[PDB]
Amino acid sequence: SSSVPSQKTYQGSYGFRLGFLHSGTAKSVTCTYSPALNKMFVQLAKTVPVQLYVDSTPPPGTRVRAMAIYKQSQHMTEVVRRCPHHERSSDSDGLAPPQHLIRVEGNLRAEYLDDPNTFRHSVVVPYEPPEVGSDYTTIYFKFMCNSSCMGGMNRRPILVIITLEDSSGNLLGRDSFEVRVCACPGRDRRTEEENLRKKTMDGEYFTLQIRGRERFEQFRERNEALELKDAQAT
Template identity: 30%
Template structure:
C-alpha cells in the first residue's frame, strides 16, 4: 500500500520541475491539480480527524484486536469449541452434497452425517483467497459432543484386524483421508486440537470457479474405521479447521456424525423424533396459553393423556417396574420365556394377542429362514382363534 501512495507524489515532483524549467505556470497548476486528485486522501483525513479522545479509543481498539489475534493463535493448544466461525473473513465452510443411491445419508434439519464404517464420502472445503496469499491446511478430527476433552479412540477389536501395519499413526486414527499428502497427527493422550488424533490436508490455492461464487472449492474424501457403538454410542461430531502454516485457526465448521450399520434407518428415526419434539413443544406452548372456557375439558383430557403417557414411560425406564399380582413373567427350565396376563374384557385380550402377532410376523419376514419364528407365529394365530371362541 505504501508503494502505491509514493508513486503519485513522485509524479508531482517531476511535473513541477519540468514546468518550472519551461516557465508555463498554468499547465503546472493543471498538472499538479490532476496529480493531487489521484492521491488517496482517506488516511490523511482519518488522522486529521482524530483528537485526544478518539486517539485513546483507537489505541484501545488496537490492543483489543491484538488480544483477539493472540487468542486465535492459541486455539490450537486449547480444547475444541463446537461452533462454526470465521476469524479472518475467509468465508470458510464445508459443503456436503448427498449423491443418489449413496451408502451414506445427510440430514439437513439435524446437520448430521450418517455413514457406514469403512465407506468413503466426499465433502468440499470452500474458502476465499486473501492477499497476501499464504499456504492453508485443513485439519479434521472427531470429538464427543458432551465431552470435548475426551479423545475419540479406536476399539481394540477393529484395530487388531486392521490390515495397515507399516503406519502406526494411520492405523490408530479413527478418521481416514484418501487425499494425497494427508498426514496423521496426535496421540492417544492428546486433548487439545493440536495434540489429539487428527488428519492434516494441504489445500491447493487454485483459481476459483465461476460456479462457486468466487470461492476456492476443493474436494476431500474421508472414511471411518470404527462405529459409534465401539465407544458406547456416544454422540460425536466431525470438526474441520482452516489453518495457516503457523497453526493459526482461521475458520471452523462442525458436522454431527453417526457411524452405523443402517444410515437410512437411523436418519429417519432421528428426524421423526425431531418432529415429535417440535410438536410436543408447540402443544405445550399452546396449552400454556389456553384459559378456562369452552375448551377447558379438551385441555384437561390432553393433560391427562400426557400424564398417563409419561407415567407409562417412567415405569418402563424404572429398574423395578410395577407388575400386577395376577400377571406372571417367568423363564422356563429349557430357556424359554413365559407370560401370563389377566384381562377384564375380551376385546382387550384380543388386542394384546394381535399386537404380539404383529411383532412376531415382522420378525419372521425379516428372518424368512427361521423355522422357529414361523412356528411361533402359527402358535399365536391358533391362540387368537381359541380366544375368539371364548364366551
C-alpha cells in the same frame, strides 16, 4: 488430562464453510447427510466426500485439519479413538496410524498427528483452491469404527471439527458436524429427523401435497433448510 478443543463455528475472514452432497434415504446409500440435524450418517470404512467453500482463496501455505471429539459434555475430555478389535484390524493404508478413527483418502500430502500433550488424534492436508472452472474443493474422509463398538466410542455420539489454519497452526476458520457411523444410515437418519419433527410441530403450519417422493424429497430439503436460517436467529 488437559482441555477440550474449541468448537465455536468461526466463519473466518475468507468465508469458510462446509458443504455436503445430497443423497437418498433408501438402505443402499453408504452415506447420507442431514441438513436438519447437521449430522453425517455413514457406514463403516466408506469414503465420505466433504466440500470446502471459500469467498476469497486463502494464502498459499494454508491447511485443513480434521478431529473428532465426544459431543457429550461428560465424555468430552476422553480421546476419541478406535476400539480394540478394529485397532488390530490391519488396513492396507499404512500411511494412517491404526488407532485413528478419521482418515483422508486420495491425498498423499495428508499428515496424521498425535498431540504431544492432549494426546488427541487428527489428520491434516494442504488447501487446494477450486479447479479451473469450478467453485469448491473436496476432501474424502473415511471413519474406521462404528459409533457402537464396545471398547471404543461405545454408543457415544461424536463431532468432527474441520479447521482452516495456516502453516503455523493459527485459526483462519472453523466448521463442524456431528457424525454417526452405523450399518443403516438411511434408517437411522429418518428416525432422528422424525424425533426432531416429533416436537415443535405445532403452531401455524400450512399443509401442502406433493406428487412423488423424489419431488417431495426436494421440497422437504429446501424447506427444512429455511427452518434453519430462521433458527440461526437464536
